[PDB]
């Protein structure tokens, strides 16, 4: 029994706590966001990740570690909570997933050239119009210094940034200093795929 204001804000505040939680559990499984369906008595949540097998191994024990962690937190009733999972088609173009691949490497002491041009090639071959990778902080010297590695083309301004550009910021702690990882990935519009409409820059004239 809430106001029309608070049912939006509670559901917003639910989602943001829930999403910061499933950063820290599902680092190995390869997290790629979620969606929450809210009902007065029923809650349905789609988790999305790359390694869908890694849940279902040990006859689905890994999901029931998560499902109790949600249930006990907000004190929801079982049956009234209804988690699924659904797989990521094209892991190449999701930003949170490809951040984790660049995180995986730079712990294990690959050069930053080779770590970026691993993923920046993997993004473009999978299917995307451009991508940028930044590795900010302290390699080699006492001063910190910024790498930026770019290909394709990458739109930075307007509304059209928000629709097209996926992006994901993070950080790696180390023995020496705190690096920052940062991967922007631009998409192509599909004809009603999974954006719909083209950019407001482009127009197309018909053939006679």
């Amino acid at each position: 029994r809430c106001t029309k204001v608070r049912r939006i804000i509670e559901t917003g505040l639910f989602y943001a706590e829930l999403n910061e939680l499933l950063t820290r559990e599902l680092t190995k499984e390869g997290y790629g966001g979620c969606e929450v369906r809210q009902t007065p008595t029923r809650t349905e949540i789609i988790i999305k990740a790359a390694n869908t097998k890694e849940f279902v191994d040990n006859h689905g024990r890994r999901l029931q570690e998560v499902r109790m962690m949600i249930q006990k937190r907000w004190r929801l009733k079982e049956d009234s909570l209804e988690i699924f999972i659904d797989r990521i088609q094209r892991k190449g173009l999701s930003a949170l997933n490809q951040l984790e691949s660049l995180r995986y490497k730079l712990i294990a002491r690959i050069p930053a050239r080779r770590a970026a041009y691993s993923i920046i090639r993997f993004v473009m071959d999978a299917g995307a119009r451009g991508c940028e990778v930044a590795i900010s902080g302290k390699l080699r010297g006492a001063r910190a210094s910024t790498s930026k590695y770019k290909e394709g083309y990458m739109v930075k301004s307007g509304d059209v940034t928000k629709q097209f550009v996926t992006q994901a910021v993070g950080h790696i702690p180390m023995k020496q200093a705190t690096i920052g990882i940062r991967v922007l990935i631009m998409l192509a519009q599909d004809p009603s795929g999974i954006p719909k409409e083209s950019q407001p820059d482009v127009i197309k004239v018909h053939e006679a």
């Binding site: 006859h59 109790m68 962690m69 006990k72 004190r75």
Partner: protein, 90 residues
């Protein structure tokens, strides 16, 4: 830490029954499910981790203690229960 004895059991039963206990990061905070100060489940939780009976994940000022393989074998030794013997059901 000095715990009282009766509160100690019904935490480690709430740990054993569920598998995941949540507690507020903030100390001196009343606790739901089992009523007590939120120092009590929190400080025993990091004791288990050192021995290695559970995993600690922390998000938004909330501490989650997910109970691993060894602690399931330990708490059958503690409570005196037959195997199989929580929330790993399918």
């Amino acid at each position: 830490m000095y715990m009282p004895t009766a509160i100690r059991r019904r935490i480690l039963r709430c740990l054993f029954e569920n598998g995941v206990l949540c507690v507020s990061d903030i100390q001196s905070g009343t606790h739901e499910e089992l009523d007590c100060l939120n120092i009590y489940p929190y400080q025993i939780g990091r004791a288990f981790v050192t021995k290695g009976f559970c995993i600690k994940t922390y998000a938004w000022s909330h501490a989650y203690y997910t109970l691993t393989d060894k602690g399931i074998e330990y708490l059958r030794n503690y409570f005196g229960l037959p195997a199989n013997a929580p929330a790993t059901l399918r």
